[PDB]
UniProtKB/Swiss-Prot annotation:
Keywords: Copper, Disulfide bond, Electron transport, Metal-binding, Periplasm, Signal, Transport. Cu cation binds at residues 46, 112, 117, 121. SUPFAM superfamilies: Cupredoxins. Its main location: periplasm. This is Azurin. Disulfide bonds join 3-26. It comes from Pseudomonas aeruginosa (strain ATCC 15692 / DSM 22644 / CIP 104116 / JCM 14847 / LMG 12228 / 1C / PRS 101 / PAO1). Transfers electrons from cytochrome c551 to cytochrome oxidase. GO terms for cellular component: periplasmic space; plasma membrane. It is found in: Periplasm. GO terms for molecular function: copper ion binding; electron transfer activity; identical protein binding; transition metal ion binding; zinc ion binding. The gene is azu.
Amino acid sequence: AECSVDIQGNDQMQFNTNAITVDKSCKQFTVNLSHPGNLPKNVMGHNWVLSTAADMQGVVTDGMASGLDKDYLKPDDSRVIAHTKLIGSGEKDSVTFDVSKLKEGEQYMFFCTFPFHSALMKGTLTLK
Ligand SMILES: [Cu+2]
Ligand SMILES: [Cu+2]
């Protein structure tokens, strides 16, 4: 089975997908994030941040208050399972995390923590 996925966020606060599936036989999983847009990082920045469905609101709120200098993530936030860096127009970044960090039956969300982007840019990640 495949153990990677390519996601894109555009100049319209859309994610290329809203549902990620991780196969149970994968030992590592990789997200390749891309920005095929024109607005820069300080205007239309996007990251890919993974957490449980319960920790989402806390990560986004504390992320907003963290500022652009911290890629809109509160430092030493234990709720972030895995994440990419905040990117701007024509930029790319990938993250690889251990599938052992995921539990079957638990429900996870991936989102962008750029202020107010999480309302449009959200999605589910399930371990299958
Ligand atoms: Cu964003
Ligand atoms: Cu980190």
